Amino acid sequence: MTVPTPYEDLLRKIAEEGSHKDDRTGTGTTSLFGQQIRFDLNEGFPLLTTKKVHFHSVVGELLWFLQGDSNVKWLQDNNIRIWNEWADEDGELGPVYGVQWRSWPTPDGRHIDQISGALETLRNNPDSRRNIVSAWNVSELENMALPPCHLLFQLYVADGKLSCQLYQRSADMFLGVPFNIASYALLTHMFAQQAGLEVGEFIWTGGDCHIYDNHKEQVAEQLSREARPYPTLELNKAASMFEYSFDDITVSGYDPHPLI
Amino acid sequence: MTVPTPYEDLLRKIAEEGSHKDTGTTSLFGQQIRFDLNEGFPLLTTKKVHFHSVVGELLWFLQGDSNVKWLQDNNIRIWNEWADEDGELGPVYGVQWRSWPTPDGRHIDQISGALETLRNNPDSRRNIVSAWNVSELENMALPPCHLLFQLYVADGKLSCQLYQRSADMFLGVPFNIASYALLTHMFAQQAGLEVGEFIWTGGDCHIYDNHKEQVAEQLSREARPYPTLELNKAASMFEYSFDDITVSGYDPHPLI
C-alpha cells in the first residue's frame, strides 16, 4: 500500500531538477551528480514493477562476473547480448569486471580473489570496515574494452543483517540502473546466504546520473504508473559463491506493468 | 534562510538511530552529506576545526611523497604513529594519487590526469581518482579510508564526490570534509571553473562511545554561517602553499 519507490523518485528528481547537456551529437542528457537509492531487501526483491526488467539477463551477467571470464562466449550461448558491441573479433573484453573481482593481478603471481576474500572476512570478521571489492584497477584500465561503471562495493553487517553499498560512476537511469540494482541486490543475497547471515539494505550510490533525451517520453510514462509490491527472491543455496546456476535463482510473484 | 547543517544532521541521526557495536561504536552504513560550495566553505562552526592541519595533509598528499618528514617540519603529527623508523608509510594516498604503479615500472599521475580531463573533457563520466590499489594494500601502513573521488562539471561548476569506507564521525570527518572541499576548490581554480557541490558518501559511519558527550554538546549548539575560502591561485596544482590558503569570516563555537 504505497510501495516505496526510491528508484522512481530519483528518476523523477533528475527529470525535474537535472542539468541539461547537449553535445550536439544527438546524445543529450539531463543529470544530477552524487545521488543515492536505498532498498530494505527484507521488504522485497528490488526488481522494478513499473516496467519489466529481464531478470534472466541480470542473473546470467552476474554468474559470468562471478566466474572471472573476460570472454563473451558463455553470454552469447545463453542469449545475453549485452556485451556484444564491445567484444573483439575473438570475443574478448580484456580484464573487465569479473577478472578484477576474481583475480586482480599482483606484480608477481598475481591474483587477488576479492570475492573469496570478501566472504571470508564476512565469516571471520564481519565488523571489518575494509570489506570492499573494486573493479577500478587504474593500471589495467587500458586493457579493458571500457572502464567499469559499477566500480566498487562495500559490505557491512549489523544485528546479523548484511548490507551492501555500490559506487557507480555513471548511470543511465532509464536503461542501465534498474538492471544494476537487481543485480547487486542479488549479489548481496548470494553473500548473505553463503555467510549464514540475513539481508539488510542495498545502497546504490551514483556519480553522473543522467536521463537521455531520447528516453523523455518513456520516463514520463513509467512515472505515471503506480508501483506494485516487489517480487520475492527464491534462492537455492549453491555449494559456494562460484557454483550458482540459473536453476538456483527464481523470482516469484513478479507483476510488472506492461511495456513500454 | 537558516544555516544548513548536513554534517550535524547526520551526526544526530547516527546517535539516534545507529546500532551499538562492541572501543565500542554506534554506526549507520551508507550515508551521504552534501554541501553547496558556493554557499560557504564547510569548515564547521559548531566546533573549531584546526585548518592548518587540513591544509598540510592535503599539500602533502598532492606532492606524492609518503615520507612523514615534511609534515613533521610543518608541525603536523597526525601520521607519526604509523611511520616506521625511517618515517616511511608505504605507498599510501598520495603515492597512489600521483603514481599508481604499472607492471612495466611506469606509473599513473591521476591528479594531473584528472586536471587534464577537467580542462579538455569536462563532461567525462570517468573522471575518477582512486587510492584503493588492491595489489598495494599489503605495503601500506594502513588502507585508504577516503578512497576514491569523482569529478563532474555542469553549468561551469565543478562538483566532487568522495567515497569513504570508514568514518570516525566526531573526530575524523570534519577534517575529511574540509580537506576535499579545499581540493575541489583547487581543481576548479586550476581549470578556471566555478564550484558546485561537495558530496561526501560514507560506508561505515560511527560515533565512538568515547565521544558521547563531546557529541551531545556539539549537537546542542547553533551553527554560524560558514566561512569563505581565500585561495590564491598557485602556478599549478602542485605548487600551492600554506600562504595561499586561508579562511575568512570563520566564527566557530570553541574546540571540544
From Swiss-Prot, chain B:
Q: Which UniProt keywords apply?
A: Cytoplasm, Methyltransferase, Nucleotide biosynthesis, Transferase
- Residues that hold dUMP according to the record: R125, R126, R165, S166, A167, D168, N176, H206, I207, Y208
Against InterPro entries, the record matches this protein to: Thymidate_synth/dCMP_Mease, Thymidate_synth/dCMP_Mease_dom, Thymidate_synth/dCMP_Mease_sf, Thymidylate_synthase, Thymidylate_synthase_AS
Entry's EC annotation? 2.1.1.45
Entry annotation: catalytic residues:
C145
**Chain segments annotated as transmembrane:** none
The enzyme's first-digit EC class, named in words, is transferase
Q: What is its main location?
A: cytoplasm
Q: Which domain of life is it from?
A: Bacteria
Q: Enumerate the PROSITE patterns for this protein.
A: THYMIDYLATE_SYNTHASE (PS00091)
Q: Name one GO cellular component term.
A: cytosol
Physiological role: Catalyzes the reductive methylation of 2'-deoxyuridine-5'-monophosphate (dUMP) to 2'-deoxythymidine-5'-monophosphate (dTMP) while utilizing 5,10-methylenetetrahydrofolate (mTHF) as the methyl donor and reductant in the reaction, yielding dihydrofolate (DHF) as a by-product. This enzymatic reaction provides an intracellular de novo source of dTMP, an essential precursor for DNA biosynthesis.
Name the chain's protein: Thymidylate synthase
Q: Which gene name belongs to this protein?
A: thyA
